[PDB]
Write a protein that binds this ligand. Structure first.
Ligand code: FE2
Length: 209
């Protein structure tokens, strides 16, 4: 559905498997890169951001190499900037990226790092960073916690890394698990509830937009 998009699996090559979700003007994908493998350098008109969820990656961008740490660093490739990746480990790299045509001034950075902050809506501790067209927020949703109803100007894509989280977007409800995402268009009502016995790690991307 629009709010709970069904992904399309793509076997890109024998070392790269994708799950591709469309969220209106944004394409979101979960990627799995095989041990010691590569995603060869390319360019495209869409701006791109992403993070490693498990494993490690080396970002080849412009004239440099930047290491990307799981759940910490975000790569930032502006429109038509050449970028590629190498998996330096003997373990798979599981990550995500978002692609969108943006009309923003260039980013000062090709890599960003999440830092400690406090989430506006929940007042819970989070790790976040703001870039030129996006903000990424990672936060723990404690067992039993209800994310209160909220509606924003910004589009939001989110997903969880573990457990099961109830998410309501407008009139639709779904119990989300890793491998699924939610998408809340501008001005749509979102709310959620962790009815599980575990703390759930949630990642959201706010599109600025
Ligand atoms: Fe790309």
């Amino acid at each position: 559905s629009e709010f709970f998009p069904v992904p399309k699996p793509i076997k890109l090559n024998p070392h790269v498997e994708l799950e591709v979700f469309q969220c209106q003007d944004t394409i979101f994908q979960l990627s799995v890169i095989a041990p010691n493998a590569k995603l060869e350098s390319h360019q495209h008109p869409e701006s791109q951001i992403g993070m490693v969820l498990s494993g490690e990656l080396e970002l080849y961008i412009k004239d440099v190499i930047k290491p990307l740490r799981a759940l910490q660093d975000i790569h930032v490739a502006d429109a038509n900037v050449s970028h590629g990746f190498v998996n330096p480990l003997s373990e798979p790299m599981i990550g995500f990226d978002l692609k969108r045509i943006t009309s923003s001034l260039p980013s000062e950075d090709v890599v960003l790092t999440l830092s400690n902050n406090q989430d506006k809506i929940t007042h819970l501790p989070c790790q976040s960073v703001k870039g030129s067209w996006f903000e990424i927020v990672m936060m723990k949703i404690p067992s039993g916690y209800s994310i209160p109803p909220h509606q924003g100007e910004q589009e939001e894509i989110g997903f969880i890394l573990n457990g099961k989280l109830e998410i309501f977007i407008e009139n639709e409800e779904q119990c989300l698990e890793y491998g699924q995402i939610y998408y809340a268009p501008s001005k749509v009502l979102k709310k959620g509830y962790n009815s599980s016995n575990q703390d759930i790690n949630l990642i959201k991307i706010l599109i600025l937009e």
